[PDB]
Design a protein around this ligand. Structure first.
Ligand SMILES: COc1ccc(Cc2n[nH]c(=S)[nH]c2=S)cc1
Length: 135
C-alpha cells in the first residue's frame, strides 16, 4: 500500500541551483572540489523497500548511495569526503537529514513542491536551494 514517502520515489534531475558555492565554503569544501562539484548536474534516485529508503546521487563528479531507516543514525562518507553521522526523519512531509562531524552540523531538507523536489542545504546562516524535476 501507499506511504506518504511515495511522492519522493523516482528519478530526478537537477534543474537549478542557487548559493551552492557559498554553502560548500561554509561546510569547509576546498577550492578544487567546489569547482568540480559546483559544475555537477546530478540525478537523484530515491527508492523505498519496506522501512529502508535509498537515495542515490549520480553525476560526473561522484556517484553516492545512502540507505537508512527514518530516525536511525548511520555513518556516511559524503561526496566531499567528510565522515559524518547522519540521521534522517520525516517532519511534516519533509525529509530532514542532519549530518554531524567535528563538532559541526548541517541540515539538508528535501520536499515536494508542485512537480519539483526542492533540496535546501543549510550550514550556519548559509542556505543553498537546489531544484530537481522528474527525469
Ligand atoms: C558539501 O559539498 C558537497 C558537494 C557535492 C555533493 C554531491 C551532491 N549531492 N547532492 C546534491 S543536491 N548535489 C551534489 S553535487 C555533496 C556535498
Amino acid at each position: 500500500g501507499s506511504h506518504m514517502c511515495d511522492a519522493f520515489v523516482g528519478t530526478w534531475k537537477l534543474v537549478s541551483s542557487e548559493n551552492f558555492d557559498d554553502y560548500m565554503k561554509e561546510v569547509g569544501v576546498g577550492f578544487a572540489t567546489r569547482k568540480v562539484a559546483g559544475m555537477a548536474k546530478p540525478n537523484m534516485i530515491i527508492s523505498v523497500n519496506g522501512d529502508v529508503i535509498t537515495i542515490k546521487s549520480e553525476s560526473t563528479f561522484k556517484n553516492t548511495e545512502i540507505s537508512f531507516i527514518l530516525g536511525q543514525e548511520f555513518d556516511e562518507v559524503t561526496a566531499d569526503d567528510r565522515k559524518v553521522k547522519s540521521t534522517i526523519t520525516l517532519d511534516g512531509g519533509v525529509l530532514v537529514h542532519v549530518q554531524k562531524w567535528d563538532g559541526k552540523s548541517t541540515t539538508i531538507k528535501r520536499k515536494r513542491e508542485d512537480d519539483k523536489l526542492v533540496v535546501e542545504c543549510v550550514m550556519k546562516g548559509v542556505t543553498s536551494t537546489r531544484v530537481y524535476e522528474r527525469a
